[PDB]
């Protein structure tokens, strides 16, 4: 699958999960977050040739169409499939808050 | 919403549904299909600036990240949201077959 295991162990040119570290304070301005300082949000990037992780029938038809008519720019795109939550600790004044944010980390991609 | 109604009536530069007609025989080689001869598969294309139809939290964080670090190329992508089936009539020999194919037409897009 186009998940972290496969993609991270292989130098894949086509649609795959790519590593991406985001620093809360530096990158987002989320100065209130205390822990962790950053995390691997990851992202999906890469061409979507015919049949590579086609999401739907439309994805399948377009992957073929884009191959024969690459000038139309009507290609399926590499986007997240499986995501995971992230638990963070931030303060509201001097009060600690532990919260789990949903769909923060990309674990796999697909061509849609 | 970034559906056909809004997108087709407005000249939208950012992520939106775009019209795309596909001819079965000419474009796909599906010579067996008798009716319809073609259809509007449509596709999603266009930039995904901060907050435009963000699919998830990750989509939201990345839309902001991409805005400040446009060189990293870690941007959410314009992809289908709502799709619709397509009923076709094709022949197997001299026998007619009426079949409904799922997720053939794009009705709306989102930024994922």
Curated annotation (Swiss-Prot), chains A, B:
The upper taxonomy is: Eukaryota, Metazoa, Chordata, Craniata, Vertebrata
Q: Which gene encodes it?
A: TGFB3
**Organism whose genome encodes this protein:** Homo sapiens (Human)
* Disulfide cross-links: 7-16, 15-78, 44-109, 48-111
Q: What is the effect of changing residue 109 to Y?
A: In LDS5; hypomorphic mutation; results in impaired TGF-beta signaling
Q: What is the recorded name of this protein?
A: Transforming growth factor beta-3
Q: Where in the cell is it found?
A: Secreted
Coiled-coil positions: none
């Amino acid at each position: 699958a186009l998940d972290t295991n496969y993609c991270f162990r292989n130098l894949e040119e086509n649609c795959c999960v790519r590593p991406l570290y985001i620093d809360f304070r530096q990158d987002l301005g989320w100065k209130w977050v205390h822990e962790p300082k950053g995390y691997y949000a990851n992202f999906c990037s890469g061409p979507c040739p015919y049949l590579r992780s086609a999401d739907t029938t439309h994805s399948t038809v377009l992957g073929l169409y884009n191959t024969l008519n690459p000038e139309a720019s009507a290609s399926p795109c590499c986007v997240p499939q499986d995501l995971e939550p992230l638990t963070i600790l931030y303060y509201v004044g001097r009060t600690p808050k532990v919260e789990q944010l949903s769909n923060m980390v990309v674990k796999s991609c697909k061509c849609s």
